Amino acid sequence: HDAIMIVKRALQNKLIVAGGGATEMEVSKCLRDYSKTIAGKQQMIINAFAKALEVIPRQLCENAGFDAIEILNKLRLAHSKGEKWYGVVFETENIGDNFAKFVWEPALVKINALNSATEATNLILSVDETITNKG
Amino acid sequence: ETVKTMEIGGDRVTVFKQEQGEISRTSTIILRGATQNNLDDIERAIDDGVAAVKGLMKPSGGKLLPGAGATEIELISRITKYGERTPGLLQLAIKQFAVAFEVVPRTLAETAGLDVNEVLPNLYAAHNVTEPGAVKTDHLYKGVDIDGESDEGVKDIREENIYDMLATKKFAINVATEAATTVLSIDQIIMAKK
Amino acid sequence: IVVLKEGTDASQGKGQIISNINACVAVQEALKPTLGPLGSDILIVTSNQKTTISNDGATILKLLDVVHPAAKTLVDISRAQDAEVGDGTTSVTILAGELMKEAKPFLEEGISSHLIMKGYRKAVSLAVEKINELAVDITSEKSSGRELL
Amino acid sequence: SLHDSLSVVKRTLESGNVVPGGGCVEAALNIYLDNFATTVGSREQLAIAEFAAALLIIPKTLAVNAAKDSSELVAKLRSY
Amino acid sequence: KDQGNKKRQHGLEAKKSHILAARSVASIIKTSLGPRGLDKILISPDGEITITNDGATILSQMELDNEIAKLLVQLSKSQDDEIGDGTTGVVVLASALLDQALELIQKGIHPIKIANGFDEAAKLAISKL
Amino acid sequence: QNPNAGLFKQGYNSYSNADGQIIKSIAAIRELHQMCLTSMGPCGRNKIIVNHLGKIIITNDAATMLRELDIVHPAVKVLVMATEQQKIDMGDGTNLVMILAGELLNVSEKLISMGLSAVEIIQGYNMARKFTLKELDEMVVGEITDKNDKNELLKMIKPVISSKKYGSEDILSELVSEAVSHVLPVAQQAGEIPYFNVDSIRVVKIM
């Protein structure tokens, strides 16, 4: 029954990415690499977005009681070399390969969440001067 | 001719459409989107476009002007020349009226995040050029570009075909001048308590 | 008689966007404890003296009823994400709040909102490309239709 | 003018070990320390990164004093 | 909605306010523990006046506007439907555990670790008993 | 204790140029001039306005903002009425009219500071208006031949959608052209006989 539930959840969406912040770390690393080859304020904005992408693993570690500084440093060190499947392990406070451990989240869910967050951020920041009525 | 129920995005609606006989003179636009604010903005844009289309009639409806502030810069130059030619104290007012038109390029530059201190002189140079002849030539239709990623100077209007209706601009100028004169003509306001 | 603004005025300039950022950061901090399966619960009491304790992002958003006009946009976006997707509701709010925090120094330095929006759009496009590359879907490559499961 | 030029050139020559100025050292150190911080961790990565970012103040201040857009110049320097 | 007069707390402030509320609740029934407990004169908000030393009745008739205390009150009421005889003891033990958790937090231990340690300690104590 | 002299009308609100009201009106108009300056242009931005029903209104149209905002000063009312006239008669260019009027008043403030009488300012503005209106006739580069084809319609549709919904002009212009083509009759090169009506096209949205 346990295995059937696991495989059912996996089959409901076969398009998956490494969980535990590994996907966020890979996206942040790629964004930083691209920004290193991009001039202008675009570089600063891309760096800020990449840094912000690391909030999810940071808050997950904080809520889990782990040492945020050490776990994040280890994740950065491991993810920057070799495989990109390294992520935060919640069973034990350390960094390991989530893909090998079968820890994943849907890719479409991640894409939709990123799009929604970007839309909300742009909409709130789209206005620098506003005259808003009270009610 | 045909009456059916059609499903669009999970919502079923009834449509009365004409195919061969009694051809309908009306059409409907259906917008789809998960954000209500975006849908409202799109609806406003569609309404504005529909209103503008009705303006393509004979009275300067079809006439096209170079948009993105190019027309504004040309008018600035022409009005400045006219004010210089105009004798008397009217020259100061003509020059100020010309300067008032500099807002459009300034607004375009600011809203696009471009540095006005560089765009404005570049626009002035582009619209005020010296050519090897008695008649200006080359790219005299340069407008105000927004870029946003990477660019130098501004792009020509013909590259993106950004044109404005002559009737719209003319009527807007007339109404704006009338309103400005009306406001300026008031030097005292007296009201009675209700 | 009837006043649309109820006699309340608002300032203009970077102050408005800074206040919006502050409100969004407040919402992000409020929803922060609920992130993840181990997230802490929040005790919310309605006007009818009804108390509910839960770490569900959708429930927290529904019971919070943010009054700030700006943060309400993020609340509505999160609610739409939950209704249409159902996963990552809190993650969207957290990411939005973090981006708002990061945007604050850029605004303080004089960077216009258009530049920030364009940069965020470019970064999000790059992130989508990287997600598509990282996306795993194996049919017969070093596996089979059943081995993957 | 020749006296002044000889004085300055002699001062430059007497320094037998020199490094390029005008923000070259600051930007190069920033990039090098940013790369280095990614190999240390141990609670020191944040401090090293902040120290590296600190050196970017000098080029930013120089650009501001030059009546130019400091963001673009600093970004181009970092990219180079 | 109803932003005006809306209560809110910070992490460092809430972690102490909850424990203070727990201590205040524990003081309600501290004297009622054991056969030699003290009788308390209570008047319910509905006007019910009675004298009793039962922790369950004391908590049921004694209402308060503190949400943290309402958790203890609801837990005591729920227990009253099961056995009901350990209400005072359960509340006292919960208050002591909360005070110990506060002390641990002041020493730098995350609340989740404290909860896990308390759960393991309870398991060991039950096994020994 | 301070005596009051020169006031004989009423204690109600009253303004005169003796205290510089000619510049105070311009300053008051500037409050909404700044508001509308952020709407014009392809990179325009909307604003959040709370309705009397507690609903949230977000739009890029300056005229809608003015309608949803409370107007008190008569000087602002003049510009509001001018914008309403612009919208009713033309259907577009409200931002142009508002911004142009604001800038004209701003430069009139400088003229007044210089010491130029308002009469001369008005005369010069009228002369410059006539000159600009005459010159606009010679500034035409292209012209719509009224073929009623989608390709020709898009030329005018695309710029209209821009500055109202940034980033989606390509699809909105195609939608508008398709909708118009369904209602336009079989005719070309005829600008004296109206064929297209504003109400001929209905707009609906589905979530």
PDB file of C-alpha atoms in Angstrom, chain C residues 17-149:
ATOM      1  CA  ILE C  17       6.363  51.825  -3.351  1.00  0.00           C
ATOM      2  CA  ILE C  18       8.441  51.621  -0.160  1.00  0.00           C
ATOM      3  CA  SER C  19       5.249  51.398   1.912  1.00  0.00           C
ATOM      4  CA  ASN C  20       3.930  48.700  -0.425  1.00  0.00           C
ATOM      5  CA  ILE C  21       7.199  46.803   0.050  1.00  0.00           C
ATOM      6  CA  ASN C  22       6.856  47.143   3.820  1.00  0.00           C
ATOM      7  CA  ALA C  23       3.301  45.776   3.739  1.00  0.00           C
ATOM      8  CA  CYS C  24       4.330  42.868   1.508  1.00  0.00           C
ATOM      9  CA  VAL C  25       7.249  42.083   3.829  1.00  0.00           C
ATOM     10  CA  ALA C  26       4.857  42.130   6.783  1.00  0.00           C
ATOM     11  CA  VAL C  27       2.630  39.612   4.996  1.00  0.00           C
ATOM     12  CA  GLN C  28       5.674  37.481   4.143  1.00  0.00           C
ATOM     13  CA  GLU C  29       6.781  37.463   7.782  1.00  0.00           C
ATOM     14  CA  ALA C  30       3.250  36.574   8.893  1.00  0.00           C
ATOM     15  CA  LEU C  31       3.113  33.594   6.519  1.00  0.00           C
ATOM     16  CA  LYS C  32       6.758  32.529   7.064  1.00  0.00           C
ATOM     17  CA  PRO C  33       6.167  30.078   9.969  1.00  0.00           C
ATOM     18  CA  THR C  34       3.764  28.001   7.845  1.00  0.00           C
ATOM     19  CA  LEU C  35       6.247  27.128   5.080  1.00  0.00           C
ATOM     20  CA  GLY C  36       7.079  23.447   4.723  1.00  0.00           C
ATOM     21  CA  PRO C  37       5.546  20.337   6.289  1.00  0.00           C
ATOM     22  CA  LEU C  38       7.117  21.282   9.646  1.00  0.00           C
ATOM     23  CA  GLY C  39       5.920  24.887   9.541  1.00  0.00           C
ATOM     24  CA  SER C  40       4.463  26.296  12.733  1.00  0.00           C
ATOM     25  CA  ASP C  41       0.747  26.946  13.124  1.00  0.00           C
ATOM     26  CA  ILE C  42      -0.826  30.394  13.461  1.00  0.00           C
ATOM     27  CA  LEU C  43      -3.755  31.139  15.778  1.00  0.00           C
ATOM     28  CA  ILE C  44      -6.191  33.455  13.973  1.00  0.00           C
ATOM     29  CA  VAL C  45      -9.401  34.755  15.565  1.00  0.00           C
ATOM     30  CA  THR C  46     -12.246  36.064  13.421  1.00  0.00           C
ATOM     31  CA  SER C  47     -14.566  38.927  14.325  1.00  0.00           C
ATOM     32  CA  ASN C  48     -17.120  36.313  15.448  1.00  0.00           C
ATOM     33  CA  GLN C  49     -14.705  35.005  18.123  1.00  0.00           C
ATOM     34  CA  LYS C  50     -13.931  31.870  16.086  1.00  0.00           C
ATOM     35  CA  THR C  51     -10.412  30.512  16.623  1.00  0.00           C
ATOM     36  CA  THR C  52      -8.629  28.372  14.023  1.00  0.00           C
ATOM     37  CA  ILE C  53      -5.120  26.911  14.321  1.00  0.00           C
ATOM     38  CA  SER C  54      -3.469  25.567  11.171  1.00  0.00           C
ATOM     39  CA  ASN C  55      -0.390  25.952   8.978  1.00  0.00           C
ATOM     40  CA  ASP C  56      -2.312  25.720   5.688  1.00  0.00           C
ATOM     41  CA  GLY C  57      -1.360  28.653   3.479  1.00  0.00           C
ATOM     42  CA  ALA C  58      -4.810  28.955   1.926  1.00  0.00           C
ATOM     43  CA  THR C  59      -6.538  29.041   5.319  1.00  0.00           C
ATOM     44  CA  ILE C  60      -4.097  31.649   6.641  1.00  0.00           C
ATOM     45  CA  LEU C  61      -4.630  33.833   3.571  1.00  0.00           C
ATOM     46  CA  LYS C  62      -8.417  33.497   3.812  1.00  0.00           C
ATOM     47  CA  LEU C  63      -8.533  34.351   7.528  1.00  0.00           C
ATOM     48  CA  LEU C  64      -5.956  37.160   7.339  1.00  0.00           C
ATOM     49  CA  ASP C  65      -8.027  39.414   5.042  1.00  0.00           C
ATOM     50  CA  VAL C  66      -5.232  41.891   4.405  1.00  0.00           C
ATOM     51  CA  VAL C  67      -6.580  45.439   4.184  1.00  0.00           C
ATOM     52  CA  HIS C  68      -3.571  47.036   2.468  1.00  0.00           C
ATOM     53  CA  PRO C  69      -4.418  47.665  -1.220  1.00  0.00           C
ATOM     54  CA  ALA C  70      -0.980  46.496  -2.399  1.00  0.00           C
ATOM     55  CA  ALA C  71      -0.476  43.322  -0.351  1.00  0.00           C
ATOM     56  CA  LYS C  72      -4.023  42.306  -1.287  1.00  0.00           C
ATOM     57  CA  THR C  73      -2.677  41.780  -4.810  1.00  0.00           C
ATOM     58  CA  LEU C  74      -0.216  39.174  -3.532  1.00  0.00           C
ATOM     59  CA  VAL C  75      -2.947  37.606  -1.390  1.00  0.00           C
ATOM     60  CA  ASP C  76      -5.203  37.282  -4.439  1.00  0.00           C
ATOM     61  CA  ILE C  77      -2.358  35.853  -6.528  1.00  0.00           C
ATOM     62  CA  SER C  78      -1.633  33.245  -3.850  1.00  0.00           C
ATOM     63  CA  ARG C  79      -5.328  32.357  -3.613  1.00  0.00           C
ATOM     64  CA  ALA C  80      -5.518  31.948  -7.394  1.00  0.00           C
ATOM     65  CA  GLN C  81      -2.401  29.759  -7.349  1.00  0.00           C
ATOM     66  CA  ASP C  82      -3.938  27.578  -4.638  1.00  0.00           C
ATOM     67  CA  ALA C  83      -7.274  27.305  -6.461  1.00  0.00           C
ATOM     68  CA  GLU C  84      -5.748  26.488  -9.858  1.00  0.00           C
ATOM     69  CA  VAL C  85      -2.619  24.555  -8.794  1.00  0.00           C
ATOM     70  CA  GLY C  86      -3.026  23.705  -5.104  1.00  0.00           C
ATOM     71  CA  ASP C  87       0.724  23.296  -4.487  1.00  0.00           C
ATOM     72  CA  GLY C  88       3.251  25.948  -3.511  1.00  0.00           C
ATOM     73  CA  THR C  89       0.700  28.460  -2.213  1.00  0.00           C
ATOM     74  CA  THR C  90       3.019  29.588   0.587  1.00  0.00           C
ATOM     75  CA  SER C  91       6.079  29.347  -1.666  1.00  0.00           C
ATOM     76  CA  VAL C  92       4.700  31.972  -4.057  1.00  0.00           C
ATOM     77  CA  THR C  93       4.087  34.394  -1.185  1.00  0.00           C
ATOM     78  CA  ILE C  94       7.549  33.777   0.275  1.00  0.00           C
ATOM     79  CA  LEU C  95       9.260  34.285  -3.090  1.00  0.00           C
ATOM     80  CA  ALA C  96       7.261  37.454  -3.743  1.00  0.00           C
ATOM     81  CA  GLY C  97       8.167  38.858  -0.334  1.00  0.00           C
ATOM     82  CA  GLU C  98      11.844  38.040  -0.824  1.00  0.00           C
ATOM     83  CA  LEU C  99      11.835  39.749  -4.225  1.00  0.00           C
ATOM     84  CA  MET C 100      10.151  42.795  -2.678  1.00  0.00           C
ATOM     85  CA  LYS C 101      12.856  42.874   0.001  1.00  0.00           C
ATOM     86  CA  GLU C 102      15.581  42.676  -2.645  1.00  0.00           C
ATOM     87  CA  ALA C 103      13.957  45.437  -4.713  1.00  0.00           C
ATOM     88  CA  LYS C 104      14.071  47.912  -1.809  1.00  0.00           C
ATOM     89  CA  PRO C 105      17.797  48.804  -2.088  1.00  0.00           C
ATOM     90  CA  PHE C 106      17.459  49.157  -5.867  1.00  0.00           C
ATOM     91  CA  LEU C 107      14.627  51.658  -5.438  1.00  0.00           C
ATOM     92  CA  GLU C 108      16.591  53.501  -2.748  1.00  0.00           C
ATOM     93  CA  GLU C 109      19.444  53.878  -5.256  1.00  0.00           C
ATOM     94  CA  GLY C 110      17.145  55.454  -7.863  1.00  0.00           C
ATOM     95  CA  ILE C 111      16.524  52.445 -10.124  1.00  0.00           C
ATOM     96  CA  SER C 112      13.147  52.770 -11.829  1.00  0.00           C
ATOM     97  CA  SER C 113      10.507  50.063 -11.526  1.00  0.00           C
ATOM     98  CA  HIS C 114      10.657  49.361 -15.271  1.00  0.00           C
ATOM     99  CA  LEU C 115      14.293  48.253 -15.066  1.00  0.00           C
ATOM    100  CA  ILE C 116      13.581  45.972 -12.101  1.00  0.00           C
ATOM    101  CA  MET C 117      10.561  44.467 -13.861  1.00  0.00           C
ATOM    102  CA  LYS C 118      12.518  43.820 -17.062  1.00  0.00           C
ATOM    103  CA  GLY C 119      15.391  42.233 -15.155  1.00  0.00           C
ATOM    104  CA  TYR C 120      13.004  40.031 -13.184  1.00  0.00           C
ATOM    105  CA  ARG C 121      11.288  38.950 -16.405  1.00  0.00           C
ATOM    106  CA  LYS C 122      14.626  38.042 -17.999  1.00  0.00           C
ATOM    107  CA  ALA C 123      15.728  36.145 -14.889  1.00  0.00           C
ATOM    108  CA  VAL C 124      12.402  34.292 -14.773  1.00  0.00           C
ATOM    109  CA  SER C 125      12.734  33.322 -18.436  1.00  0.00           C
ATOM    110  CA  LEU C 126      16.216  31.968 -17.717  1.00  0.00           C
ATOM    111  CA  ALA C 127      14.865  30.120 -14.671  1.00  0.00           C
ATOM    112  CA  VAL C 128      12.086  28.576 -16.773  1.00  0.00           C
ATOM    113  CA  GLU C 129      14.658  27.411 -19.320  1.00  0.00           C
ATOM    114  CA  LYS C 130      16.790  25.893 -16.552  1.00  0.00           C
ATOM    115  CA  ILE C 131      13.722  24.191 -15.050  1.00  0.00           C
ATOM    116  CA  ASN C 132      12.845  22.702 -18.436  1.00  0.00           C
ATOM    117  CA  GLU C 133      16.415  21.435 -18.783  1.00  0.00           C
ATOM    118  CA  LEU C 134      16.355  19.984 -15.255  1.00  0.00           C
ATOM    119  CA  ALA C 135      12.894  18.464 -15.734  1.00  0.00           C
ATOM    120  CA  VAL C 136      13.107  14.665 -15.636  1.00  0.00           C
ATOM    121  CA  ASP C 137      10.935  12.516 -17.909  1.00  0.00           C
ATOM    122  CA  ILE C 138      12.355   9.070 -18.714  1.00  0.00           C
ATOM    123  CA  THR C 139      10.550   6.527 -20.892  1.00  0.00           C
ATOM    124  CA  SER C 140      13.311   4.221 -22.168  1.00  0.00           C
ATOM    125  CA  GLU C 141      16.526   6.190 -21.485  1.00  0.00           C
ATOM    126  CA  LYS C 142      18.455   4.027 -18.999  1.00  0.00           C
ATOM    127  CA  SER C 143      15.058   2.925 -17.662  1.00  0.00           C
ATOM    128  CA  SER C 144      11.601   1.640 -18.605  1.00  0.00           C
ATOM    129  CA  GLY C 145       7.959   2.608 -18.242  1.00  0.00           C
ATOM    130  CA  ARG C 146       7.817   0.735 -14.913  1.00  0.00           C
ATOM    131  CA  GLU C 147      11.410   0.841 -13.642  1.00  0.00           C
ATOM    132  CA  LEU C 148      11.193   4.603 -13.084  1.00  0.00           C
ATOM    133  CA  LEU C 149       8.395   3.857 -10.601  1.00  0.00           C
TER     134      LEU C 149
END
